[PDB]
Design a binder for this molecule. Structure first.
Ligand SMILES: CCCCCCCCCCCCCCCCCC(=O)OC[C@H](COP(=O)(O)OCCN)OC(=O)CCCCCCCCCCCCCCCCC
Ligand SMILES: CCCCCCCCCCCCCCCCCC(=O)OC[C@H](COP(=O)(O)OCCN)OC(=O)CCCCCCCCCCCCCCCCC
Ligand SMILES: CCCCCCCCCCCCO[C@@H]1O[C@H](CO)[C@@H](O[C@H]2O[C@H](CO)[C@@H](O)[C@H](O)[C@H]2O)[C@H](O)[C@H]1O
Ligand SMILES: Nc1nc2c(ncn2[C@@H]2O[C@H](COP(=O)(O)OP(=O)(O)OP(=O)(O)O)[C@@H](O)[C@H]2O)c(=O)[nH]1
Ligand SMILES: [Mg+2]
Lengths: 48, 52, 347, 63, 320, 98, 82
C-alpha cells in the first residue's frame, strides 16, 4: 500500500520524460524532411 | 463503444482490413487486364476497365 | 578495480579490435591483437580467485602462442612478396600458419580446449566479451585473406568445430560451459561458408552475437550460472523464462525465428557451388545443439522445477540489474526472419 | 471474382515469376563467369594501389 | 543519481561521509538477556540507527507498506511451533533457522548500506556472525539433522565472506539459571518450554566459538547482567575504544564502493540463500510454489514494481 | 633461400616445439615464448636489412616493445599462480576440467 | 592566493617533483615561443645528404641555375650569419 520506503520511481523523472519525448519528436521531424529531400532529389535526377 | 463490447470489433475490422488489402493487391496485377488472348475485347462505351 | 580504470581497459579492448579492422598493414594487425590481449586479461582476473587465475593463464598462453604463429606468417609473407599489405598471402606455408593462428584465436576445434575452461573460469560479463566481441578481430582478418586460404584446411576446421561443439555441449550442466561449446559449434558455420561467400560469414557472425548477447544478459539479470540455479527463474521472474525459451529455440535454428536465417543463407550459398553433402551433414549435426538447447528450455520454461523456501524472500525485491539493450536484443534474436533480404546491407 | 479477373491476374503473376526466374538463372551464370575470369565488379580482390609509389629521383640512379 | 560507478566517479566516496562516529555495533547475548533494551539505549545515546533484531517478518517491514505478511509468504515457519514441537516432521525447525539467517543477512546488508551512504553508525541485535549459535543449539539437542547443518554452512560460507564484521561486539553474559527465571517472568507460554540444556548450548557456542573469533577482528565488550543495566556506562566504554584491529583498517574508497554496490542490490545479497540444494526441510514443490507465488502477486501493491501499483494510489503510470 | 634462413627458421621451430611440449615449471615455457620472439626479430631484421627496406627498419624495434608487454603480462600471471599454490607448476592449474 | 599556498607547500615537501614539473613545462612551452625554432628546420633542410640530381633544361626554367655559382637557387647567406 502506501510504501514504507519512497519508491525510486515514485514520481515521474520529468527531465527524462522531456528528453524522451523531445528525442522522439526530433527524430520524427528529421526522418520526414530527409524523406522529402530524398523524394525531390530523386525526381530531379530522373527528370521528373 | 460500450465498456463491454469494444473488443468485438477487432476481428470484424481485421477481416474488413484484410479484404481491403486483398483488393489493393489486384491493383498491382493489371499488366494483362484486357490483354489475354482468351478474354481480350473492346471496352463498352462507358466502361473504363474490364475489371477492377 | 577503479571504475575509471575499468572504462579505460574496456576502451582498450575495443581499440585493439578496431585497429585490426582498419589496418592495411600486417604489423598493425598484429599490434591490434596484442593490445586486445593485454587489456582483456585484467577483465578475466577481475574477481581474483584461483579459477580466474587459471582461466587467465590458459587464455594468455593460447593467445600468445597464436600471435607468434601469426607474426611468423607475416614475416614469411614479407620474404616472398616484400610487402605488408593486409590481403591475400603470397606463400602457402604462410597461409597455413596464419589460418591456424586465427583458428586458435577463435577457439575452433581442435584448438578448442581453452574455450570451455576459460569461459567457465571468468564472470558472466567477461564471458560475454570473450564469446562475442573477441570474435570480431580474427573474423575480420579471415574476411580479407580467404582468397589464399586452403579450402581443405578451413572446411576441416569447420567440420570438426560443429561436431565437437555439438557433442561437447551434451555433457554440460554449467551454463558458461554450455555457451562455450555452443560458440564453438557456431564458429564452424561461419568459416564453412567463408570460401564461398564472405557476406554470409558476417551475417552469421552478427546474428550469433545478438543471440549470444541476449542469453548472457538474461543469465546476468538473474545471476545464474548453472542449470539448476536457472531452473528457479520461473518462481522469480516468469517473463524471463519465456524470453529464454524464444531465444534458445532461435539459437537452435528453428523457423520462423531469426536463428534460422544464417543456417538458411549458408545452405543456399553452399548449394549454389554444388556443395550438397557438406551442408546436409552440417544441418543434421546442428541437431545436437538443438538437443541441449531443448534441455535448458525444459528445465527453465516448459516445466516447473522444485523451489526452496528462501526463494520467497526474493519475491519482495525488484530486478536491479542494468540489463542494457535486452528488450531490443531479444526481439532481434527472435523476430527478424521476415526481414532476411536486409542481409544485402552487409554486401 | 469473375473468371476473367482471376485468369488475367494469373497471367500477371506468371509474368513476374517468370521474369524473376530468368534473372535468377542469369545471375548464377554471371557469377560463374565473373569469378572465373575476374573481369567484373564482383570478386574484385584488391591489388596494391599504385599511387603509393614514389617516383622522385632516389639517392642512387639504378632503381 | 542512483548510486553506481557514475556517482562514485563524481565524488560519492565513502571516505567523505565516514567519521570517527560511523560504527557498526552488535549487541549479543542469550535469550531474555536484556539485549533489546541495551541496544536501544546505546543507539539513542550515541546517535546511531537502531535495528530491532531481525525476525520472521523483517523483510516485510522493509518492503510494501511495512506490515507483516501472512505466514504462508514466509513458508509458514513459526517460532511458536519450534518451541512447542522442536522435532516437527515438517522440518519447521531448520526452515525457520534458514529463514532467520536470510533475514539477518538482509538486515546486515541494509545496515551496511545505511552506514556507507550516510556515515551514521548503526546498532544491531545479533547478526549473521552470531546466528550460528542457535543452529548449534538445535543440532546438539537433536532438533535438526546433520544435513541441515551442512546446508547452513554452505550458505554461510558463500555469503558471510562478502561483508565486514561489526566494529564493536557488545555481549551481555547472563548465566542460564538466571535466564530460565527471566523467561518464567516474561510470561510467553511457548517460550517456557525451552529446556535449560538448549540454553546452555546457546551459551557454549557464544563463549566457545563466537567471542574467540570476534576478538581477533573486532572490539569485544562483555558485561554481566548488572553492568548492562546502565547503558550510560556501556556507552562510555564504546567512546574510548582504540579501534586498532580488524579489516576496517584495510578498507578504502575502492573497496567500500564495491561493497556498496552489493548491499544496495538486495537480490544480489540474497543470491546464494536459495542455492539448488534439495533438503526436505527447505525444498518446496512446484505446485505449492506456483500457488503461493500467485497469491503473493494478488496482494495490495505487490503486482508491479513499487511506484507502478495503481491499486494503492500510484499516479502517472503512463509517464513512469 | 640463403643458408642463414635455415638456422633462423630452425630456431623458431625449436622454440615452438619447446613451447608446445610443457614440463612442470611455467617459467620454462615463458622462456620459450621469449625465444620465439627473438627468432622472429632476427628473421625479420635480416629480411629488412638485406632488402634495404628503409622504413621497415623500425619494425623489429616495435616487435620488441610488444614482446616485453607479453613477457611482463606472463610474469604477472606467474606471480598469481605462485601465490595461490606456492609453485609455478602447470599441473596445479587443472581446476577448470570441472 | 591558492596558487602560492600550494606551490610553497610542495617546495617544502617535494622540491624534486617541483623542479621536475617546472623543467618539463618549459620543454613543452618554450619551443612555441622561441624565435630561433624556425631555423632548426631550415638547417636540417639545407644539409645535403643526397646528390642534387640535375634537371633536363627544356628551355624555360628561369628560376633554376645552370651552374652552382649562378645567382639562382637557394642561398645560405642566412646560415653564415647565424
Ligand atoms: C513475428 C513474425 C516472426 C515470428 C517469430 C516468432 C515471434 C515470437 C517471438 C517471441 C518473443 C519473446 C516474447 C514473448 C512474449 C511472451 C509474453 C508472456 O509470456 O507473458 C508474460 C508472462 C510473464 O509473467 P508475468 O510478467 O509475471 O505476468 C503475470 C503472470 N505471472 O508469461 C508467463 O507468465 C508464462 C509463464 C509460464 C511459461 C509458459 C511457457 C509456454 C508459453 C510460451 C509462449 C511463447 C513462445 C515463444 C516462442 C516462439 C513462438 C513462435
Ligand atoms: C549488436 C549486439 C549488441 C550487444 C550489446 C551487449 C549489451 C550487453 C549489456 C549487458 C547488461 C549490462 C550489464 O550488466 O553490464 C555487464 C558488463 C559490465 O560488467 P558488470 O558486471 O555489469 O559490472 C562491472 C563492475 N565490475 O557489460 C559489459 O562489459 C559490456 C560487454 C558487451 C560488449 C560486447 C557486445 C557484443 C559485441 C557487440 C558488437 C556488435 C557488432
Ligand atoms: C608450425 C610450423 C613451424 C615451422 C615453420 C617453418 C616456416 C618455414 C617457412 C619456409 C617457407 C618456404 O616456402 C616454400 O618455398 C618454396 C621455394 O622453393 C616454394 O616452392 C614452390 O614455389 C616456387 C615458386 O612459387 C617454386 O620453387 C616451385 O613452384 C615450388 O617448389 C613453396 O611454394 C613455398 O611454400
Ligand atoms: N530457533 C531460533 N530462535 C531465535 C533465533 N533468534 C531469536 N530467536 C528467538 O526469538 C526470541 C526473541 O529473542 P531474544 O531477544 O533473545 O529474547 P528476549 O525476550 O527478547 O530478551 P532480550 O535479549 O532482552 O531482547 C527468542 O525466543 C529467541 O529464542 C534464532 O536464530 N533461532
Ligand atoms: Mg529481544
Amino acid at each position: 500500500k502506501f510504501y514504507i520506503q519512497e519508491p525510486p520511481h515514485g514520481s515521474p523523472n520529468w527531465l527524462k520524460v522531456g528528453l524522451t519525448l523531445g528525442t522522439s519528436v526530433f527524430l520524427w521531424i528529421y526522418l520526414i524532411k530527409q524523406h522529402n529531400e530524398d523524394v525531390l532529389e530523386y525526381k530531379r535526377r530522373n527528370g521528373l | 463503444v460500450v465498456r463491454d463490447h469494444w473488443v468485438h470489433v477487432l476481428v470484424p475490422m481485421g477481416f474488413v482490413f484484410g479484404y481491403y488489402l486483398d483488393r489493393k493487391n489486384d491493383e498491382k496485377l493489371t499488366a494483362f487486364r484486357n490483354k489475354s488472348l482468351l478474354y481480350k475485347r473492346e471496352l463498352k462505351p462507358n466502361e473504363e476497365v474490364t475489371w477492377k | 578495480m577503479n571504475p575509471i580504470i575499468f572504462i579505460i581497459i574496456l576502451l582498450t579492448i575495443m581499440l585493439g579490435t578496431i585497429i585490426v579492422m582498419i589496418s592495411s598493414h600486417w604489423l598493425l594487425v598484429w599490434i591490434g591483437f596484442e593490445m586486445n590481449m593485454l587489456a582483456i586479461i585484467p577483465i578475466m582476473m577481475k574477481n581474483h580467485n584461483p579459477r580466474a587465475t587459471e582461466a587467465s593463464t590458459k587464455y594468455f598462453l593460447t593467445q600468445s602462442t597464436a600471435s607468434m604463429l601469426l607474426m611468423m606468417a607475416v614475416i614469411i609473407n614479407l620474404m616472398f612478396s616484400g610487402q605488408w599489405t593486409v590481403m591475400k598471402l603470397f606463400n602457402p606455408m604462410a597461409s597455413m600458419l596464419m589460418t591456424m593462428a586465427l583458428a586458435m584465436k577463435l577457439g575452433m576445434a581442435p584448438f578448442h580446449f581453452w574455450v570451455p575452461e576459460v569461459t567457465q573460469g571468468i564472470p558472466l560479463s567477461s564471458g560475454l566479451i570473450l564469446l562475442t566481441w573477441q570474435k570480431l578481430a580474427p573474423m575480420s582478418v579471415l574476411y580479407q585473406i580467404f582468397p589464399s586460404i586452403n579450402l581443405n584446411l578451413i572446411l576441416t576446421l569447420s567440420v570438426l568445430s560443429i561436431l565437437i561443439g555439438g557433442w561437447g555441449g551434451l555433457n554440460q550442466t554449467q551454463l558458461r560451459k554450455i555457451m562455450a561449446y555452443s560458440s564453438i559449434a557456431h564458429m564452424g558455420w561461419m568459416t564453412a561458408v567463408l570460401p564461398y561467400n564472405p557476406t554470409m560469414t558476417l551475417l552469421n557472425l552478427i546474428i550469433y552475437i545478438i543471440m549470444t548477447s541476449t542469453m548472457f544478459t538474461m543469465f546476468m539479470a538473474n545471476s545464474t550460472t548453472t542449470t539448476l540455479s536457472l531452473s528457479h527463474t520461473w518462481n522469480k521472474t516468469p517473463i524471463m523464462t519465456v524470453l529464454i525459451l524464444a531465444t534458445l529455440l532461435s539459437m537452435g535454428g528453428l523457423p520462423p525465428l531469426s536463428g534460422f536465417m544464417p543456417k538458411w543463407m549458408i545452405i543456399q550459398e553452399m548449394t549454389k557451388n554444388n556443395s550438397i553433402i557438406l551442408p546436409t551433414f552440417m544441418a543434421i549435426t546442428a541437431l545436437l545443439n538443438l538437443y541441449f538447447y531443448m534441455r535448458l528450455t525444459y528445465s527453465t520454461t516448459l516445466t516447473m522445477f522444485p523451489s526452496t523456501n528462501n526463494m520467497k524472500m526474493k519475491w519482495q525485491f525488484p530486478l536491479m540489474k542494468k540489463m542494457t539493450f535486452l528488450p531490443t536484443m531479444v526481439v532481434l534474436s527472435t523476430m527478424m526472419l521476415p526481414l532476411t533480404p536486409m542481409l544485402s546491407v552487409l554486401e | 471474382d469473375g473468371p476473367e479477373k482471376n485468369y488475367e491476374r494469373t497471367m500477371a503473376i506468371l509474368q513476374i515469376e517468370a521474369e524473376k526466374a530468368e534473372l535468377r538463372l542469369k545471375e548464377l551464370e554471371v557469377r560463374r563467369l565473373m569469378r572465373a575470369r575476374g573481369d567484373g565488379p564482383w570478386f574484385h580482390y584488391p591489388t596494391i594501389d599504385k599511387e603509393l609509389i614514389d617516383h622522385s629521383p632516389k639517392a642512387t640512379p639504378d632503381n | 543519481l542512483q548510486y553506481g560507478p557514475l556517482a562514485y566517479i563524481l565524488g560519492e566516496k565513502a571516505t567523505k561521509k565516514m567519521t570517527e562516529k560511523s560504527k557498526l555495533i552488535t549487541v549479543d547475548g542469550n535469550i531474555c538477556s536484556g539485549k533489546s533494551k541495551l541496544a536501544k539505549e546505546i543507539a539513542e545515546k550515541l546517535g546511531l540507527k537502531h535495528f530491532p533484531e531481525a525476525g520472521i517478518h523483517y523483510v516485510d517491514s522493509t518492503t510494501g507498506d511495512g506490515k507483516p505478511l501472512p505466514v504462508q509468504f514466509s513458508g509458514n515457519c513459526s517460532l511458536e511451533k519450534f518451541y512447542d514441537d522442536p522435532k516437527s516432521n515438517d522440518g519447521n525447525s531448520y526452515r525457520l533457522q534458514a529463514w532467520l539467517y536470510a533475514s539477518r543477512l538482509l538486515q546486515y546488508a541494509d545496515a551496511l548500506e545505511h552506514l556507507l551512504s550516510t556515515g551514521q553508525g548503526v546498532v544491531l541485535e545479533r547478526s549473521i556472525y552470531s546466528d550460528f549459535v542457535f543452529l548449534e543449539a538445535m543440532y546438539r539437542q537433536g532438533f535438526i539433522r546433520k544435513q541441515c547443518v551442512d546446508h547452513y554452512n554452505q550458505v554461510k560460507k558463500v555469503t558471510i565472506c562478502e561483508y565486514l564484521p561489526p566494529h564493536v561486539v557488545v555481549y551481555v553474559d547472563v548465566p542460564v539459571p538466571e535466564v530460565q527465571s527471566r523467561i518464567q517472568k516474561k510470561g510467553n507460554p511457548h517460550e517456557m518450554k525451552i529446556t535449560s540444556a538448549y540454553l546452555q548450548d546457546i551459551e557454549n557456542a557464544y563463549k566457545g566459538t563466537f567471542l574467540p573469533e570476534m576478538s581477533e577482528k573486532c572490539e569485544v565488550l562483555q558485561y554481566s547482567a548488572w553492568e548492562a543495566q546502565d547503558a550510560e556506562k556501556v556507552v562510555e566504554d564504546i567512546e574510548y575504544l582504540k579501534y586498532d584491529k580488524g579489516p576496517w583498517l584495510d578498507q578504502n574508497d575502492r573497496k567500500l564502493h564495491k561493497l556498496r554496490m552489493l548491499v544496495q542490490d538486495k537480490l544480489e545479497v540474497l543470491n546464494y540463500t536459495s542455492i539448488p540444494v534439495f533438503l526436505p526441510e527447505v525444498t518446496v514443490g512446484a505446485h505449492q510454489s506456483d500457488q503461493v507465488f500467485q497469491e503473493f502477486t494478488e496482494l495490495p501493491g505487490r503486482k508491479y514494481r513499487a511506484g507502478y501499483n495503481e491499486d494503492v494510489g500510484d499516479k502517472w503510470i503512463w509517464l513512469k | 633461400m640463403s643458408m642463414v634462413y635455415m638456422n633462423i627458421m630452425m630456431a623458431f621451430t625449436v622454440s615452438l616445439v619447446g613451447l608446445l611440449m610443457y614440463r612442470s615449471h611455467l617459467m620454462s615455457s615463458l622462456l620459450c615464448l621469449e625465444g620465439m620472439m627473438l627468432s622472429l626479430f632476427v628473421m625479420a631484421a635480416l629480411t629488412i636489412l638485406n632488402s634495404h627496406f628503409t622504413l621497415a627498419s623500425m619494425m623489429p624495434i616495435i616487435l620488441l616493445v610488444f614482446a616485453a608487454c607479453e613477457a611482463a603480462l606472463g610474469l604477472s600471471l606467474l606471480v598469481m599462480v605462485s601465490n595461490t599454490y606456492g609453485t609455478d607448476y602447470v599441473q596445479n592449474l587443472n581446476l577448470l576440467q570441472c | 592566493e591558492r596558487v602560492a599556498a600550494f606551490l610553497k607547500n610542495v617546495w617544502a615537501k617535494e622540491p624534486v617533483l617541483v623542479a621536475s614539473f617546472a623543467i618539463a613545462g618549459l620543454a613543452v612551452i618554450l619551443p612555441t615561443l622561441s624565435p630561433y625554432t624556425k631555423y632548426s628546420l631550415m638547417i636540417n633542410r639545407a644539409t645535403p645528404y643526397n646528390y642534387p640530381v640535375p634537371l633536363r633544361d627544356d628551355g624555360n626554367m628561369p628560376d633554376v641555375p645552370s651552374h652552382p655559382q649562378d645567382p639562382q637557387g637557394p642561398s645560405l647567406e642566412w646560415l653564415k650569419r647565424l
